[PDB]
Amino acid sequence: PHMERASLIQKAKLAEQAERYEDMAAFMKGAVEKGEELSCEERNLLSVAYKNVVGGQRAAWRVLSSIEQKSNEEGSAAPEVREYREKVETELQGVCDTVLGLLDSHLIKEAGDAESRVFYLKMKGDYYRYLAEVATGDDKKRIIDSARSAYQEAMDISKKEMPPTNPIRLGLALNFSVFHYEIANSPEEAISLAKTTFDEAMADLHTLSEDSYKDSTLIMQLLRDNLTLWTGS
Amino acid sequence: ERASLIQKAKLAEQAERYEDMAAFMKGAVEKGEELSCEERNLLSVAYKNVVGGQRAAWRVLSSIEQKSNAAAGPEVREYREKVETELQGVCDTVLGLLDSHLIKEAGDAESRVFYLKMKGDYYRYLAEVATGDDKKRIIDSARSAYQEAMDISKKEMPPTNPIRLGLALNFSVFHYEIANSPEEAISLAKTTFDEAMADLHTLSEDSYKDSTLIMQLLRDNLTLWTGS
Amino acid sequence: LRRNSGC
Amino acid sequence: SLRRNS
């Protein structure tokens, strides 16, 4: 048998090594469902697992939707694209709904510490943002807002409890700025957030230790890359 | 319908959704019509990628499992068994497709060799994980397919044929890895390469490219196996 | 050339 | 010496 918590975490680590992220997410969902708090290491296993799962689905959906755009333009040729893009969409939506379900049923705890609350709320914003990437209906407004709320709630915590060099704070601001640019269609808000975030973390880089510096400068480079792309430096 | 399944398999390929692609190709095969050379490759690519990932994962887990003593619990064995069962199920599906629809009395030697190579290949995948007494029969089921394909390729095809070349490459891999006959493996790879080399002069731009590709895989294997 | 987000 | 080709 061996579907006790420790064994589920062991199997999620093993699934990661084997690049079986569908399986890893399943083990992590089962581990979450045991009701114990996730350690920082455990949190990352859950995040990595689902990030990879949705990652592949989103990637596929983008491929199909671009093809569909070509198919429906003025003066092109003569349903499979739409049908199959809908299959992938439904599948992707199901995964987000699963992650969001876990976050609201077990992971988001008023009781949790600042770094973990931020982690999960950033996660809630990411997965709603993923739903908003494919949302076309009247639901788009509700979804967009559900992501805004989660990121903003996470922002508020990160800005009080964390230093501007915190990789979790940095990561959140990066994603929230991507949300503004892509989803909310607020490039001005996005550029500013990314600029401020980077500039504030830069002003504190001197204090950081060997390990801290590596994780922080990683995200800062992602912010800088985005800023270069968005502004045209 | 069939058209739509092939269309969707091509779309799944573009989206790198090989699990879906294999499913569509299985459904297209199940329509009963002959797959076109293009359509065969779609089926092969789809399943090759699916099993490819499973085998890769199984090798990772089995290595973790064998490097016992540096820890190993029931999760390594249990999870390696999960992946194994899953992988075995895919092979069983492909082989089912092959016996039920693809391997037919007489077609063109190219399609004929392709599907028997395929049969050998998927039995070899099963052999890769096989541990019991079944190992013997699975190994034999692969030997038979590869040999039946060999017989066709050696009669109907020139030694430069990429399908003939590819088959010989995989059968030599079978002789080395699976059958544990390195002598037989080295010889097959040597003969195959040497015979295709003796006919390279005849080939056109398109032909040459495909043939020399496999010839390099044969040469790389020979270098690895002989230690030169 | 695609915007960066979560690692 | 790396993995055999197939």
**Please, are residues A92 and A61 in contact by the beta-carbon 8 Å criterion?**
yes
Contacts of B11 (CB under 8 A, 6+ apart): A64, A67, A80, A81, A84
Spatial distance between the Cα atoms of A213 and B82, rounded to a whole number of angstroms? 40
Q: Is the dihedral of CA B125, B127, B128, B131 positive or negative?
A: positive
**Please, are residues A215 and A222 in contact by the beta-carbon 8 Å criterion?**
no
**Please, are residues B172 and B143 in contact by the beta-carbon 8 Å criterion?**
no
B210, with CB counted inside 10 A (0-12, 13-18, 19+), is: middle
Spatial distance between the Cα atoms of B184 and B176, rounded to a whole number of angstroms? 8
CA distances from A152 to A126, A146, B76 (A): 12, 10, 41
Residues B23, B25, B27: CA angle, nearest 5 degrees:
70
- B74 vs A contacts (CB less than 8 Å): 2, 7
Q: Give the residue among B181, B133, B223 at the shortest CA–CA distance from B173.
A: B181
Look at C3 and A182 and tell me if their CB atoms are within 8 Å. yes
Residue in C1, C3, C7 nearest the CB of A178: C3
CA distances from B87 to A1, A53, B139, B142 (A): 20, 19, 17, 16
Spatial distance between the Cα atoms of B147 and B116, rounded to a whole number of angstroms? 9
Domain borders along chain A are: 5-231
Kindly compute the dihedral angle of the four CA atoms of residues A37, A40, A41, A47, in this order, to the nearest 10 degrees: 80
Q: How many CB pairs under 8 A join A and C?
A: 29
Look at A20 and B57 and tell me if their CB atoms are within 8 Å. yes
Q: A56 at the B interface (CB within 8 A)?
A: yes
Nearest CA distance, A150 vs chain C (angstrom): 15
Q: B76 at the A interface (CB within 8 A)?
A: yes
Spatial distance between the Cα atoms of B25 and B38, rounded to a whole number of angstroms? 12
Stated length of chain A: 233
**Please, are residues A12 and A24 in contact by the beta-carbon 8 Å criterion?**
yes
Q: Which residue has the tokens 């004929």?
A: B112
CATH topology of domain A5-231: Delta-Endotoxin; domain 1 (1.20.190)
The DSSP-derived string for chain B is -HHHHHHHHHHHHHTT-HHHHHHHHHHHHTT-PPPPHHHHHHHHHHHHHHHHHHHHHHHHHHHHHH-------HHHHHHHHHHHHHHHHHHHHHHHHIIIIIS-SSS-HHHHHHHHHHHHHHHHHHHHH--SSHHHHHHHHHHHHHHHHHHHHHHHS-TT-HHHHHHHHHHHHIIIIIS--HHHHHHHHHHHHHHHHTTTTT--HHHHHHHHHHHHHHHHHHHHHHT-
What DSSP element (H or E) covers A171?
helix A167-178
Q: Under CATH, to which class is B1-226 assigned?
A: mainly alpha
Nearest CA distance, C6 vs chain A (angstrom): 7
- A173 vs C contacts (CB less than 8 Å): none
Q: Give the residue among B10, B17, B14, B11 at the shortest CA–CA distance from B39.
A: B10
When scoring A19, A20, A64 by the number of chain B Cβ atoms within 10 A, the one with the most, hence best to mutate, is A20
